[PDB]
């Protein structure tokens, strides 16, 4: 009877603990990340924490390029993060092949979400402890942010944050938008949108950053790319000469 907490079956409350515990694992990395929509780009900032001196910093990342246009940032342990990445990449290539056009960020999300839903209903598949944020500049929808979770849920956002201090970053952003009245950063260049993201990431977390404390990803028309220590540095210097 008390195994309704070991596998994905209902509890009398009508809950799925294993799904909840899955969510719990997503913070295991203690990294926060947020995504904002530019005028015609989409940026995703994520914290980067490489404590060990023996680690090769360059190999550490929770940002992935699923396709030329879709990028994905994962909040959760890395081994589950990579299992998810790979599957999405495959799902992306197959889609192109079968339908003759690049899989739209939102569709990729829906497909991964449906995939998660299954681990939610089938007993032998454990959910993946990760929250996936997919970003792109859809050829039909414009800048896009779609996030999925271990529950098999997903939705599109004007912007979004994930991780331990998720709530601080969220409300920070919510406020910025209640103010601007628009659903996006009214900026033409992505560098400024990147700076905006990094800025509020600082305001909300009340912390200063160095080129190596961040990880940035940008999605533009027909291409998604990640910045470099230097690309970021130059960006950090920018916010500095405004404060």
């Amino acid at each position: 009877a008390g195994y309704d907490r070991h596998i994905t079956i209902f509890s009398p409350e009508g809950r799925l603990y294993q799904v909840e515990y899955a969510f719990k694992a997503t913070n295991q990395t203690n990294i926060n990340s947020l995504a904002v929509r530019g005028k015609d780009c989409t940026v995703v900032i994520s914290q980067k924490k490489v404590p060990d001196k023996l680690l090769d910093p360059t190999t550490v990342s929770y940002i992935f390029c699923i396709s030329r246009t879709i990028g994905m940032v994962v909040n959760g342990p890395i081994p589950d993060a990579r299992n998810a990445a790979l599957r999405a990449k495959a799902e992306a290539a197959e889609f192109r092949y079968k339908y003759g056009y690049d899989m739209p960020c939102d569709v990729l999300a829906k497909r991964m979400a449906n995939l998660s839903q299954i681990y939610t209903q089938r007993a032998y598949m454990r959910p993946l402890g990760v929250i996936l944020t997919f970003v792109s500049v859809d050829e039909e929808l414009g800048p896009s942010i779609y996030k999925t979770d271990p529950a098999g849920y997903y939705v599109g956002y004007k912007a979004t944050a994930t991780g331990p201090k998720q709530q601080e970053i969220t409300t920070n952003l919510e406020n910025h938008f209640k103010k601007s009245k628009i659903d996006h950063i009214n900026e033409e260049s992505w560098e400024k949108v990147v700076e905006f993201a990094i800025t509020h990431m600082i305001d909300a977390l009340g912390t200063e950053f160095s080129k190596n404390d961040l990880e940035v990803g940008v999605a533009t028309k027909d291409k998604f790319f990640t910045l470099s220590a230097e690309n970021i540095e130059e960006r950090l210097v920018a916010i500095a000469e405004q404060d």
Binding site: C65, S67, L86, K89, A90, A92, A93, E94, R96, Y97
Partner: protein, 196 residues
């Protein structure tokens, strides 16, 4: 069909006629036998179209997934996938494919995949029905590390001839330049290459 790939000083150039016939009837006079499997890795298709197209389509998909996981693939690797498909299914395929791609370290490379599904890397390769008529010509005019212009001429002449003699070839000559400077489409019309 008349298709060739020539490596030169700045990279590589692919060329082809635009005629696809079904018997003596020209089903398409503006065909594009130059197919793109990757950014700077293209191929020349000869043999069954249903087959070379299906093979190409599958290759592009494999190189796309490859990239997603391990970054840009080498021109060699591209030849390798084509070969794998052609060799492994040699009994149900009629595809003669030339694979050409520009690399930064390797510059230009050309792999020809004949009917048996074997692979051959060469300075340049010709293929298709019209190719037979230009073996002597191409052998007597090709040189290594020609300039972009010399090479566009070499291809323009060779194919104009093959188009001349082979009825299964014709229409316009299409080329695709692959160099560090990017990818460039070139087209030449009858009126131009005929009187060469």
């Amino acid at each position: 069909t008349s298709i060739m790939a020539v490596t030169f000083k700045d990279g590589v150039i692919l060329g082809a006629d635009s005629r696809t016939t079904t018997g003596a009837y020209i089903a398409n006079r503006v065909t594009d036998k130059l197919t793109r499997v990757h950014d700077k890795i293209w191929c020349c298709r000869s043999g069954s179209a249903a087959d070379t197209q299906a093979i190409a389509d599958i290759v592009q998909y494999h190189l796309e997934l490859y990239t997603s996981q391990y970054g840009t693939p080498s021109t060699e690797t591209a030849a390798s996938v084509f070969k794998e498909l052609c060799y492994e299914n040699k009994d149900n395929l009629t595809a003669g494919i030339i694979v050409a791609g520009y690399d930064d370290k390797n510059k230009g490379e050309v792999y020809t995949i004949p009917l048996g599904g074997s692979v051959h890397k060469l300075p340049y390769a010709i293929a298709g029905s019209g190719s037979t008529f230009i073996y002597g010509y191409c052998d007597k005019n090709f040189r290594e590390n020609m300039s972009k212009e010399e090479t566009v001429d070499f291809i323009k002449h060779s194919l104009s001839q093959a188009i001349k003699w082979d009825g299964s070839s014709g229409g316009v000559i299409r080329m695709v330049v692959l160099t560090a400077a990017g990818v460039e489409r070139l087209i030449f019309y009858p009126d131009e290459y005929e009187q060469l």
